[PDB]
Each structure stands twice: as C-alpha cells, then as structure tokens.
Design a protein around this ligand. Structure first.
Ligand code: NAP
Ligand code: 40E
Ligand code: MG
Ligand code: MG
Length: 466
C-alpha cells in the first residue's frame, strides 16, 4: 500500500476552510494545537465551560459553544467520546451545521455501527491517528509525528480523500506515514488492538509480572522497576528493528528463553481468544455491550480507574518515578521478551489472517505499543489509561483479563522458579549442545515472516526524515 508522507500531500484542499474541533480532550487538544501550528483555521466547539474549556483558554483558544462553532464551520470534527457523539450530533450539530459541511471522525465506531446516519450531501471521512492523543501533540512539537489511517465513508465533493490526507498532514501524521483504509477496517482493527494488546493486554501483562515478582520475594520497588524498564527496552528494540532486531540484541540464552517461554506463556489458546474478541467486535456485540454500560453510567470504568489509582502497583510506581526524577533479573528478561514477542506476534497475525492490511496491523499492534509503553514508563498505568478513549478503557478493562488470564501469572511463576534454581541455565546449556536448533529455526521463520518483511519496509519509510 502507498504510505503517504509530507511530500505527497498538499494542504491546499483545506487552506481556507474553518475547521471546528468539537471537544478538547485527548485527541481534541492535540488536533487543535497541531492544526493551528500548521497554519490552518481552527475553532474549538464545546457544550459546557468545564475542564476542557479552561484548558483550551489556557492554550490561547476562545472556544465557542458547539452550535455556534458548527454554524460557521466548513469541516466539523467529532473529538468527543464515542458514546457522546450521537447526542451531540442530534442536539447541537445536525440542525445547526452549514449545509454541505464535512463531517470528520477520528474513529469509525459511530458511522460503521450506524449510530449516526449523516446527511447525503456532506463528505464524511476520517483521520485515525495510531497513537494516544498526548503523543499526537508531543511528536508534532518535537518535529515528528505518528502514523494514521485515513478513510472516506461518503464522498460528495469528489475530494474527500485529499481533504483527509490534508488534515493528516496538518496534525503531523504524514511526517511518519498515512495509509488509506476504510471505516470498517479502522473500527475493527482499532477496537481489537486496544482490547487485546495496547490497553488490555499490556496492562494485565505488567500487573502479572509485578505480582509474580512480588510473590517470589522481590521488594515492590524492584518488581516495578524490573518490569517496566525491561518492557521499555524490549518494545523500543522492536519499534526500531523488529522482532529479529530485538532478538539479535539480546544474548543467545535470552533468545532461547524468550522463544520457548513466550509460546508457553502465550499459547494457542490465546490466539483462539483473540479471534473470539475480534468476532465479538465484528458482530456488533462489543458495541451493544459498551452502549449498555455507558447508559448505566460507565460504572465498570469508574470503578476500575479508582481501584487502579489507589492500587499497590500504582503507588509504588509513583514513588519510584519520583525518586528517579529527584536523582535517587534474568527470569524477568525472558518472561517479558517471550510474553511481549508472542503477544505482538499473535495480535498481528490475527489481523493479517482475518484479511486486514498488514500495514494497518503493524501500526496498530507493533508500532503503537511503543507509544503506549512510553506513556506507561513516564506516567504509570493510570497516566496511560487517562490518555486513551473511554471506548478503549472499557475494552481494556473487560478484555485484558480474558487475554491475560490468571493462569498467566501461574505460568510466570513456574518459569521464574526454573530460572532461580539454575534449572533454566542447565536447559540453555543443553539446547546449546544440540547447536541451538530452536533458535536458528525461529530466526529462519521470522526472517521470511509477514510481520518482519512488512515491518522492515514500514520502519524504513517512517524513519525517513523523522
Ligand atoms: N484517546 C485517544 O488517544 C484516541 C486515539 C485515536 C482516536 N480516538 C478517538 O478520538 C475521538 C475522541 O476521543 P478522546 O478520547 O480524544 O475524547 P475525550 O478525551 O474523552 O473527550 C473529552 C472532550 O469531550 C467532552 N465531553 C465529555 N463528555 C461530553 C458530553 N456528555 N457532551 C459533550 N461533550 C463531552 C469534554 O468536555 P468537558 O471537559 O466539558 O467534559 C472534552 O472536551 C473518539 O472517536 C475516539 O475513539 C481517541
Ligand atoms: C490505545 C489507544 C490510544 N488507542 C485508541 O484507539 C483509543 O484510545 O481508543
Ligand atoms: Mg487506536
Ligand atoms: Mg480506539
């Protein structure tokens, strides 16, 4: 697929249009700031003078009320929570917008699941950054960007795609790479990625590793540090150089440990569970369940957030990060190398087997994980969870423990015990006397694999001039 960069895209299609950004949260603030820095005409539209109104004023915007912003808009962007969009649309947009104004989304959920039926005489299109909102901004302001999908649901001008690409450039995404997709593909892959790996999976893997180290007798501060530091090292290596590059950066013993432990901790049953998660998404069952939860007041989301914020793991992480700010395990290596490699691989391959563009699968299940893990490293799980959408919070909370279930810390424990006893060392010394056939066989299968051949091509194009 074509991966569009800055030199491929003109801003001219949006140059003199008034762009109304509805909402000023995680994506909304990022888009508004980025678009304004890129020279475009932005107004911020809000329902209320609340927290995000105050934030927008502090950033030099003068927000308008939603109905007033949409009256003067050529392009209307829905950057409020997915569950809120129908109500905003019905009450503040539909009867107030210019006739023919563009309707623009950052996630396909409402259009794809037919929650909002747009008018027939508007362009309807999407730019979906494959990044948490704050990193859309942070990348842009460092002179870089994050990847994005664009899609067109309804073309009435005949230039909807060019306008989507222009907006993607305007928010910095063409510095990294933009791929054309569909509302269906974006929605399905996006919900899948956040549920199984980007929010749900990684969060539960981190908790499992932390708990397991603590049960084995490590002090909490050491269990936290070992977990998150090794996670960052491993995910950074993959982000830069793929699975093969990561494996070549660690010892042969760690290669063998990673490879074997990974398939133990993350086994076929997990691949089956990922397909279940995908079908629940495809069939509309997730959407119906999320709508029902939302209409109850999102009690599951509020509960989880408040338990997480108060938890031992988050208290310990906050204390650790603060002590590091102010200046003040080889089992864990292989458990994480294995667990993260096989979770990535299973997530990516599920999407590719199901027919989605492999490039989209790579942005969603590989590239974006580095951005997530950077947020976790900097701000803890609670900071990460605050940055992601409510849809992703709910998906992660419900699916994460399905993918990484209780048994995974049980398997971790077993592996950790074999390491501590010197049993893992005997086992490495042996496979080694067979000429490391398990290691060479895996390197050989990785070399030819879709994830590595696509990743290498994309990483070359992405890090071109970034
Ligand atoms: N978060 C991510 O990184 C991410 C990644 C890619 C795409 N997406 C997509 O981007 C879109 C926006 O998601 P987001 O997470 O950026 O949104 P968000 O941060 O949750 O949105 C908060 C904004 O929406 C307003 N809002 C909250 N409840 C509202 C209500 N009942 N009525 C009207 N306005 C309300 C808030 O105003 P107050 O301050 O007054 O409450 C605030 O301006 C979604 O389609 C999402 O799927 C998000
Ligand atoms: C992981 C997260 C940033 N991605 C999303 O698509 C979202 O927040 O909904
Ligand atoms: Mg996403
Ligand atoms: Mg999402």
């Amino acid at each position: 697929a074509k991966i569009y960069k800055d030199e491929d895209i003109s801003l001219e299609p949006i140059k003199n249009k008034t762009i109304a950004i509805l909402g000023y949260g995680s994506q909304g603030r990022a888009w508004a700031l980025n678009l304004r820095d890129s020279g475009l005409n932005v107004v911020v539209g809000l329902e209320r003078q609340g927290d995000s109104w105050r934030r927008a004023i502090d950033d030099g915007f003068k927000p308008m009320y939603t109905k007033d912003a949409v009256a003067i808009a050529d392009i209307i962007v829905f950057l409020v929570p997915d569950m809120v969009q129908k109500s905003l649309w019905l009450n503040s947009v539909k009867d107030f917008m210019k006739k023919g104004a563009d309707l623009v989304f950052a996630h396909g959920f409402n259009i794809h699941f037919k929650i909002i039926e747009p008018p027939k005489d508007s362009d309807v299109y999407m730019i979906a950054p494959k990044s948490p909102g704050p990193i859309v901004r942070r990348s842009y302001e460092m002179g870089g960007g994050v990847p994005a999908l664009v899609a067109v649901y309804q073309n009435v001008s005949g230039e909807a795609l060019q306008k989507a690409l222009a907006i993607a450039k305007g928010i910095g995404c063409a510095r990294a790479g933009v791929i054309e997709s569909t509302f269906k593909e974006e929605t399905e892959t996006d919900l899948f990625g956040e549920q199984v790996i980007l929010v749900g999976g990684i969060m539960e893997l981190i908790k499992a590793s932390f708990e397991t180290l603590v049960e084995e007798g490590y002090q909490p501060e050491v269990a936290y540090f070992e977990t998150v530091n090794e996670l960052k090292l491993i995910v950074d290596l993959i982000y830069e150089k793929g699975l093969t590059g990561m494996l070549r950066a660690v010892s042969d013993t760690a290669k063998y440990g990673g490879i074997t432990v990974g398939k133990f901790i993350i086994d076929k049953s997990v691949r089956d569970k990922m397909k279940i998660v995908l079908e629940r998404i495809r069939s509309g069952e997730f959407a119906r369940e999320w709508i029902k939860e939302y209409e109850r007041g999102m009690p599951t989301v509020f509960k989880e957030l408040s338990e997480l914020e108060g938890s031992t793991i988050e208290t310990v992480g906050r204390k650790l990060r603060e002590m590091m700010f102010r200046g003040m395990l080889f089992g864990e290596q292989v458990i994480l190398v294995g667990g993260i490699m096989e979770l990535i691989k299973a997530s990516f391959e599920t999407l590719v087997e199901e027919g989605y563009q492999p490039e989209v699968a790579y942005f969603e299940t590989v590239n974006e994980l580095k951005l997530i893990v950077d947020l976790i490293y900097e701000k803890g799980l609670t900071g990460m969870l605050r940055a992601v959408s409510d849809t992703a919070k709910y998906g992660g909370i419900t699916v994460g423990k399905f993918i990484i279930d209780k048994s995974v810390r049980d398997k971790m424990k077993i592996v950790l015990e074999r390491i501590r006893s010197g049993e893992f060392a005997r086992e490495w010394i042996k496979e080694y006397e067979r000429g490391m056939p398990t290691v060479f066989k895996e390197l050989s299968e990785l070399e030819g694999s879709t994830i590595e051949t696509v990743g290498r091509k994309l990483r070359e194009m992405m890090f071109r001039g970034m």
